Amino acid sequence: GMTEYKLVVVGARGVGKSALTIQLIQNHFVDEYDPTIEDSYRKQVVIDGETCLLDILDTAGQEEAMRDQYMRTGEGFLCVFAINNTKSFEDIHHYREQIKRVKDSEDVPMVLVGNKCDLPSRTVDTKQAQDLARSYGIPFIETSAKTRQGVDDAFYTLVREIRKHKE
């Protein structure tokens, strides 16, 4: 595609940032846990009639100190938590606050992603996460990288949010 969208996937360790990205790009589910330092991907897609290029940065999970470099370069952010990891959900606000500080824009293209919805051990209610997304004024998408549930939707929705912001 010709229009380029710089997407950045952030969230706590182990929530499925890489598995989501690899499902989007390569269409398979990675069962292993290989911790990320930083990985870059490219994908040509047609969204809303426009062929475009997704430049995706798959980042290292936070330990608490997100890297300013990709918070400055990224145009939109996938903020990922796991529905069986209450702490990863509580962590989200710190990630959004760090991005908003670096951007010095009150609106920043973001999508909240609740991943691992295929698991039977949910501790984060869809309600709690929806309340957060509504307060931020951003979309909330539940995903499974394993079942591919919501994966395209999460990334494509983020591109739509970037489109409204830059234009």
Ligand SMILES: Nc1nc2c(ncn2[C@@H]2O[C@H](COP(=O)(O)OP(=O)(O)NP(=O)(O)O)[C@@H](O)[C@H]2O)c(=O)[nH]1
């Ligand atoms: N059941 C299930 N397991 C998942 C899902 N997404 C990821 N996992 C599993 O969770 C583990 C961590 O996933 P991974 O994508 O590596 O996480 P990450 O957020 O990239 N971790 P890091 O920040 O260290 O790079 C792996 O064993 C992976 O298979 C999902 O939707 N469902």
Ligand SMILES: [Mg+2]
């Ligand atoms: Mg990873």
